[PDB]
Structures are given as structure tokens and as C-alpha cells.
Amino acid sequence: NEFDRIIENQEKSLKASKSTPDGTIKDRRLFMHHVSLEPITTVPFRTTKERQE
Amino acid sequence: NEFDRIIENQEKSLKASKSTPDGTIKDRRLFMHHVSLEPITTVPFRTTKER
Amino acid sequence: AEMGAAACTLLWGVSSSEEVVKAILGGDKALKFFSITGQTMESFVKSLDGDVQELDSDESQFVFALAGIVTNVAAIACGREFLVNSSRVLLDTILQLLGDLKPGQCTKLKVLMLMSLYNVSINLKGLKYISESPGFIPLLWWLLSDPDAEVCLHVLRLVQSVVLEPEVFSKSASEFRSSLPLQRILAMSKSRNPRLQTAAQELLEDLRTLE
Amino acid sequence: AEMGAAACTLLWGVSSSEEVVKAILGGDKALKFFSITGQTMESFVKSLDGDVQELDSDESQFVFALAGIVTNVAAIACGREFLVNSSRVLLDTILQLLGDLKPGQCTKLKVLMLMSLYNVSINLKGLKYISESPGFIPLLWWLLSDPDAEVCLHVLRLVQSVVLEPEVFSKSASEFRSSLPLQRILAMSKSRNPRLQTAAQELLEDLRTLEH
Amino acid sequence: AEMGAAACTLLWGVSSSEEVVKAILGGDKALKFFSITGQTMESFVKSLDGDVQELDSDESQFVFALAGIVTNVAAIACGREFLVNSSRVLLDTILQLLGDLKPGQCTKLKVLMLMSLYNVSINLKGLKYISESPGFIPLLWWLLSDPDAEVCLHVLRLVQSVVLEPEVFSKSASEFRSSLPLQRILAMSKSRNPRLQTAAQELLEDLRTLEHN
Amino acid sequence: AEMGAAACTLLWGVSSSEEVVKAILGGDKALKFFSITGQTMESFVKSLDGDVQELDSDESQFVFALAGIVTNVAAIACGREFLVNSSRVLLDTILQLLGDLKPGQCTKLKVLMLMSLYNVSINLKGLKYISESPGFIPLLWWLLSDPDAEVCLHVLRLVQSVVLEPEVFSKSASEFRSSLPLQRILAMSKSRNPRLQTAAQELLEDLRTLE
Ligand SMILES: [Mg+2]
Ligand SMILES: [Mg+2]
């Protein structure tokens, strides 16, 4: 990125936003003045045979 | 980028081969002792010629 | 059996990617993946006749992977969109199996199933489909009488999702809120499980806010 | 009208990648894309009873993008697989429009359509579907009577695809070879157009190879 | 009409990929596409006599696909680079349409448009172009008067982006202290929505730290 | 049975991505999956009574998905790396099953298996492992006596990979040259189809030239 403002702060990074037909049209506008509802992404079980790392 | 054979002769490079469920199962086995049939990929028209 | 669950677990792991979820939605055409998923989940709970979960089993982790994949798909905007248009029968099966499972039976399966229903409720049509399903309010009451705190938490999270947003608002949603077990939600708002206590507190604020 | 064709032309450009083709498969469910594509192509050729070509117009550019996208989708294994399972009506429309278009009329549209039928024929079921479609052999004869060499070339390429690969290879495919315009294929094998001459040359070598 | 919106919607879906965005700019037909995009968006807005939008069949979905594509293109480094070099008129149209849309009217179109202005601001020339556009500061404080929280979040995110370059922010001095809605930004730093709350909290931290440093 | 093949087929589809292959290898069930893969492939071939090459309706589509996944994993640098370090029993099984399958039997399975051995041979240790496997040279000549052109092409591609990098070739040279069929490879140098035409032509310019 020759152009692009490359900020001198790590925690103040500029992060771009992408949109989707279903996210924008088929989803409920769940970002409100109460709270934002967001999806749950599950990750497989680490069976009751857990050795270590 | 480390444990694999990186050949010096660029003209005889090692190229890996990937497979697909439809390509392997639903397609005709078109690599035959006659010739290999391959798909056509079209690209949009460049009408009025390039500038 | 063992091989089937290993492949399903692998698919559950990679399904956390949007790119993989998009790729799964086309496959359902040739191999009815979501149609046979519901049948496999239905077959599993039916097989637990006079018994509760066995866990650490090859069959247990197969259906966990199935309900985990359905959740991870529903987590993606086009995934929940696909489910409510194409796999309405799978949604029916999830809702049916939640009511068919007795309290304390298949706790981890019920949580995973409740998480996929919350995800599909993020989609406008998915919210209507779930809330308008037969015996939905009696099911919410039934699931809140489960002794497991994690199950109760995910029922409250689904109820919160249903409470929020218009839903016509002209006594269509006004009667939904009044018909909830407010005494149980109150009891769970003073719970010793911090995650459950905060979900019931949040839901109580939302019920009071819209009253 | 102009905006529609501009979006279709961009889609035709990006549809050359497998990654984009997978992404358009699934999108046809909520958009009816391949179902309305056939209707738009059918509406275009039915709108022009007269005129051989209304070129440069955004109406022709729109349908060129549509047939170009159908070809680029069929070029990918899961794309031709999807078309023969879900969009059989679009295949019907392409085959119908090829027979409805008179020789010399919409030449570039006929080539693009013939390229998508060759691509779907790579799929086993797609070959079965095209070859068993009504009036298919009379259509092959009709398309080979076109004065444009590029059209003739893509008909010969489809015929070669149909000749190769066992269609049970008993007497279903044996009768197929007998019913071809072998007089025209031999005339095209001596053609002055080198791409067409070599296509008819290769098809003749295949036909002679499978002669009992 | 229906076919046009279906192709735009597919393009919106695939435009989330950098590889597709590069391919769109690479094809010599994108320049026409982006010039007529602004005209179509302007035509759609002007056609609304208030009301709402009633999810217009393949009409709203068509302009939402258009703003969605502009947003997804600007999200890629060479996409926001292309826009500020070739499609400056489209940027003018976006800025105009944001001020032309009344609060509460076409909320989804305003967030897609405010998302693309933030994305183009990531490019140095894009930040210069947006911040030096006619009533830019009056537009910002006014878009904050929108009751929708998502619109307010994306206005704060854009404000933070210009505020984060105190060289660009120094040209638009005086009115940044005179007209800023400190009270509304303060109220936003107390919202029960954490993403809106911390956006206003972080903007307040940067606004108070620049007036003193 | 049907559910198992549907999950495997989806995994085969998504495994064409490097990002998915990295994610698969970084999984606790990954070592299990590849261990039971070889067992499932071994079990499948030990069921054929001649019949058709594949009997279809899953089972064959399950093992085609399995060999397809092994191929797609080996196609990625860390995938072939993982296989030679962790799954060398799966490599043993592939090599065994290629010699166990009679010519003309399960042609599509043999090609997929030969493609995965070429891909693992791209890794230095993978080349060492395959070339030093028992009866490897006799296997190469038995596979070249297959009437199917695609099988022959992938055997020639593996042979070329083995003769490239002369450290491994100048060890089994006495076994390869004093056993190489000059009535099959020499006759196969025919023009017929171009990808076979160049496969034997490039091999001729390396195998014959030993000076
Ligand atoms: Mg029941
Ligand atoms: Mg007709």
C-alpha cells in the first residue's frame, strides 16, 4: 500500500468495512441503542480425554 | 517453503495436481488416447478497439 | 461410525470460515447435506429411548459436529439466509428435537441447537419462522425448566432476540412478552451462575424497556 | 438498460475465475438468475424478427454478457454440474434459440451459446441432456449450413464432443455418426479457414476411427 | 429491470474479494460503471418523496447493490485509490446524497455510503478530497442528529478518521471547535451499545487531547 | 453411510483451498482422520468382486472423497509435510492399494492415489519415503501395464519426479534400468494425445540420458 494512511499508532488502526447482500438486506438491523446482537461461532469439543498442549 | 524440493531447472518445475468432486465423478474422463477435451473460458468484447 | 464422526468434526472445525460456509451451500444440492443432517439428529434422539447421553462416544460427537456445523453455517449472513429458504425442514427438526428432549438429556446437543436457532433468528425471515412455529412459547417454558444453566442461558438469549425488533409491535409482540415465565427469569436474575444471571438481567431490562 | 449491461459485462469479466463461479452458484436460488437469464435471452431474439445484427447496442451487449457468463460458469466442473441439475430450462432455451436464430443472424450470440453447450457436454449428464434434446441432430445440420466459419467450428467442436465418450457406444452412438452431414464435414475439412479446416479434419479422423 | 438487479446483487456478493476487486478495476469498463452508478443512486434518491422505501422490488435492492459494490471496492487499497483518481464525481454524489437524505429516510443506504466514505478516507488523497468537500463539517454534525445508532456509529468512525490526521484536521479548524455536537457525542459515550459507546468514548479522548497538546 | 459420504464430499470440495488445508492440519481430530482414512480405503478395496470399477451410490463416492482429500492436502506444502511426518502408514496403504488393484479395476481411485504420491514426492522426505518403499519399481511397471491412459500418465509423472533430483535416482538405478519395460514405455512415446505425448517425451530426455 504505497498510498494509504499508515498511522503511527497500533491501537488506533484504520479498519475497512465490507458489506454483503444478505447481511445488508436479509438480516435484522440489530445494531441498536440498547445493544448489538451478533452471531455465535462454535468450535469443536476437546473431548474428556484432554492430554495437554 | 522449506522441506520441499525446489528444483533449479525452472523449465522442468514440479507442479502439484488438485481434484474436485464433480471433476472426478460427474465429468466424463476426457483425457483419452485420442486427445483431451477442455473447457472454454470467454472474456468480454473489447469493442471500438484499445486506445 | 468412527470415520463418519471424524470427518464431521473436521468439517465443524473448518466451518468457522465464511469461505467454507459459502462452499457448503452449493453442495446441499447433489447430496442433501442439511436434509440428511436433520434425519441423523432425529435418529440419534429417537435412539436414546430409556437412557440419557453417553458422551466421549463416536455417535455423540457425530451429532455434536452436525449441530455445530448448522450453527457455524447460520452464523454467516448467507448461511442463515440459505437455511430459512432451503432447509426449513431442518429448522423444524431442531425445534421438534428441543421439545422431544427431556430436561437433563443431551445437554450439549440442546445448547448447540439453541445457538443455531439464535443465529437463524438474526435473519428477518428466520425470526418469523422460529417465533411462528407450533408450540414455540410452550417450548421456551419447557427449556427454561432445565436444571442446566448453559441451556437456560441460551433459551434467554433466543427469547431476547425474539423480544427485540418490531414483530408488528401492535400487540403481536406485546402479548409475546406478557406470556413469558417472568418469575423464572426473575429467579435466574438472582442466579449464582454469573453468565446466566447477566442474561436474565439483560432480558429483564429489555422486557421492562418495551412495556 | 445501459446500467444493466454494464453490471453484466463486469460479471462476465470476473466469472472467468472458479472462485467467482462457486460464489454465483447458490445466488441463483434467491435471485432466480439462471431462470431469468433464459427469459432475457429468449426475449432478445424474439424482439428481433428482422435485422441480422443490431451490434454495439446495450441490448445485445447485455445478452452477450449473459451467454458469456453461462459459458464461464459451465467451464467450471461444479458450474456445468449445477446447470444440468438446476438450470435444465436454461439449456432448453439455449438449444431452442440456436434453432430459432436464422443463419447469419446474431453470429456472436450463437458462438457463445455453442461454447456453453460444449462446456456442459464435458459433464456426463450434460452430454446425455444435450444429445437427447428434441431436434438435436436436425439442429446440428442447420447450424453447419451457417456461412460464418466460427459458428461452423463450434458446431464441429460440439459434434466431436458428442462422438467421443461412450453414450453406451452400442447402436445409439453408431446411428448418431451415420446421421451427421458427412458431405459438409468433408467440404469443411478442405476449408481455407485454418481453424475450421483442422476442426473438420480432426472430427473426420475420429469418425473414421470409430467406423465399423 | 429484474435481470439488472440480479447481476448487481451477484457482483456485490463477489466484490467482497480483493481478487475480484482488482479484476473489476483491470477491465476497461469499470470507469463507465462507476460514473453511471452515481447517476443511478442520485436518480433513486430524487425519486423518493419521503415515505420510506418499502424494500422496493429490484429498485432498492439495485441501489443497495450499487452502494454495496462501491463500499466493497473502496475496502481494497487499489479500489479506494482508483475511486479518488477516476471516480471523484461518484464521491461528490455520495456526499451530496448523504445531505439530501432526511434523518430516518433510507438508513441502510446512508450506512453503506458512510462506510464507503470511511474506506476511501483510508487513502491519503481520499481523506483530503472528502474533508475538503463543500459543507463537510455541517454534514457530519447533522448526520449525528439521526436517531439510528448505526448511522451515528459510522459518522463517528468517519470523524475519528479525519481527526486521526491532525494535518488534514488543521485545515478545517475553528468550525471543529465551534459547531461540534459535544453533548450528543457525550450522550453516545453512555449508550448501552458497546460499539457505539467506545466509538464516542475514543472520539472524545482524541478531541480533548488535540485541543490541549 | 450416506451422511458419512456427504460430509467427506463437502470436505473434498473445500480442501482445494490452502487456507482450509492449514486449518485441517491444525486440528486435534486430524491425526485420527488420516489414520482411519487408510483403514477405510483398505476396507473398500477388500470388497470388490470384479463387478464395475466403482459400485457407486456412496461407499465408492466416500472413498473417492477420501483419496481426493489426501490428494488436495498433499497439494499444499505443509500438507505433504504433515503426511510424511504423521501419516506414513497412509502412504504405505496407498502404495499397497495401487499394487492390490488389478488393471482396469477402480481406475478413478488409482489416478487420485497416484496424484497424491506425486504431490507428496514434491516434499524431499516424501520422495525418499515413496522411492524406498518395498516393491516400488515393480509397482511402477505393473501400473504402466494398465490400459487406461490417465493411469499411465500419472505413473509417468511420478517416475519423472523420482528421476528428477539425482540423489534418489542414483540409488535405485540398478533396479530401474535393469527392469524398465522397453516394449511399453518405448511404444507409449506415440503422438496419440498431447499430455501423454510430452509425458513420455520429457521422461525419454532424462531416463535415457545417463552420462
Ligand atoms: Mg414430537
Ligand atoms: Mg422453436
Author numbering:
A (entry chain E): 2291 to 2343
B (entry chain F): 2291 to 2341
C (entry chain A), F (entry chain D): 121 to 331
D (entry chain B): 121 to 332
E (entry chain C): 121 to 333
Paper text:
HSF2BP is required for meiotic HR during spermatogenesis, but in somatic cells, it inhibits HR during DNA interstrand crosslink repair by triggering BRCA2 degradation. HSF2BP contains an N-terminal α-helical oligomerisation domain and a C-terminal domain predicted to adopt an Armadillo fold. In somatic animal cells, RAD51 loading onto ssDNA depends on BRCA2, which has multiple RAD51-binding sites and is required for focal accumulation of RAD51 at the sites of damage.
The crystal structure includes four ARM domains and two BRCA2 F15X peptides. The ARM domains A and D, as well as B and C, dimerize through a symmetric interface of about 950 Å2, formed by their N-terminal regions from E122 to I156. This interface is mediated by hydrophobic residues from helices α1, helices α2, and the N-terminus of helices α3. The BRCA2 peptide in orange (chain E) runs along the V-shaped groove formed by chains A and C. Similarly, the other BRCA2 peptide (in red; chain F) runs along the groove formed by chains B and D. At the center of the tetramer, a symmetric interface of about 250 Å2 is observed between the ARM domains A and B, which involves helices α2 and helices α5. BRCA2 motif 1, from N2291 to G2313, and BRCA2 motif 2, from T2314 to R2336, can be nicely superimposed, and interact with the same surface of their respective ARM domains. Sequence alignment between the two motifs identified five identical residues: D2294/2317, R2295/2318, S2303/2326 (also a proline in some organisms), L2304/2327, and P2311/2334, and two similar residues: A2306/P2329, S2309/C2332 (T2332 in our construct), which are all conserved through evolution. For example, D2294/2317 contacts R200 (helix α5) through a set of hydrogen bonds/salt bridges; R2295/2318 is hydrogen-bonded to S281 (helix α10); L2304/2327 contacts I242 (helix α7); S2309/C2332 and P2311/2334 interact W132 (helix α1); S2309/C2332 also contacts G188 and is hydrogen-bonded to N192 (helix α4).
